[PDB]
């Protein structure tokens, strides 16, 4: 169900002229952090396969890399009617985020990605001032999973973040299915 342009953009290959703005509604739904799967051992098959297929890397290096990447105490995210909710252990923050457009990034690998930028302008909210979505999509399309960046300093600080990228799949997916997607999608 992917066009050549979408399929290549998914793999970090695209012309900048094909990148288009999106809206918050692309990430509407209830979403679950993948971090507990890593911690329980349920992602081990993912790292096992990757380590096997790549002769220059080991299981421990791969798992540690995703441990840094996935680490977060934000267990779920809900997005509905313009509001993003961050669920921690019993505690919950939210904001009606403003869209701020996107930024195209060229990574050290020469692959490319796009960050979709939002800002909380509610002086009453306790949610992060700036957030960014990255999900291998460069034009309007409902997301099937996403990486999110959050902070209070600047958008540019987040643009540089490459170590920690808390990651979220639809909360209705079983663990097997989240594993299958990480192996396949």
From Swiss-Prot:
Q: So where does Zn(2+) 2 get bound? A: 145, 181, 185
Query: What are the alphabetically sorted keywords of the record?
Result: Cadmium, Cytoplasm, Metal-binding, Nickel, Periplasm, Signal, Zinc
A GO molecular function held by the record: metal ion binding
**Which top-rank group of organisms is this from?**
Bacteria
Which positions does UniProt annotate for Zn(2+) 1 binding? 136, 145, 147
Question: Quick one: a GO biological-process term for this protein?
Answer: cellular response to zinc ion starvation
Q: Does the keyword Transport apply?
A: no
Localization (cell): Cytoplasm; Periplasm
Induction of this protein: by what? Repressed by Zur. Up-regulated in response to extreme Zn(2+) deprivation. Also induced by cadmium and hydrogen peroxide.
Knockout mutant characteristics: Mutant shows a growth defect and a lowered cellular Zn(2+) level under Zn(2+) limitation. Mutant does not bind cadmium.
Q: Which InterPro entries match?
A: Calycin, ZinT_dom
What are the record's GO terms for cellular component? cytosol; outer membrane-bounded periplasmic space
Q: Does the keyword NADP apply?
A: no
Which function does this protein serve?
May function as a periplasmic zinc chaperone or mediate direct transport of zinc from the periplasm to the cytoplasm under zinc-limited conditions. Binds zinc with high affinity, and can also bind cadmium, mercury or nickel. Preferentially binds Zn(2+) over Cd(2+). Contains one high affinity metal binding site, and can bind additional metal ions at other sites.
Protein name per the record: Metal-binding protein ZinT
Species for this entry: Escherichia coli (strain K12)
């Amino acid at each position: 169900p992917l066009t050549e342009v979408e399929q290549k953009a998914a793999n970090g290959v695209f012309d900048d002229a094909n990148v288009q703005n999106r809206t918050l509604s692309d990430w509407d739904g209830v979403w679950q952090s993948v971090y507990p799967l890593l911690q329980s051992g349920k992602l081990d098959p993912v790292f096992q396969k990757k380590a096997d297929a790549d002769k220059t890397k080991t299981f421990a290096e791969i798992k540690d890399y995703y441990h840094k990447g996935y680490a977060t105490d934000i267990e779920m995210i809900g997005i509905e009617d313009g509001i993003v909710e961050f669920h921690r252990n019993n505690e919950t923050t939210s904001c009606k985020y403003d869209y701020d457009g996107y930024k195209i990034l060229t990574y050290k690998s020469g692959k490319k990605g796009v960050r979709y930028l939002f800002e909380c302008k509610d002086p009453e909210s306790k949610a992060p001032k700036y957030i960014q979505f990255s999900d291998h999509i460069i034009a309007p399309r409902k997301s099937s999973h996403f990486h999110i960046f959050m902070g209070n300093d600047s958008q540019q600080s987040l643009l540089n973040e490459m170590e920690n990228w808390p990651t979220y799949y639809p909360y209705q997916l079983s663990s097997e299915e989240v594993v299958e997607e990480m192996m396949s999608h």
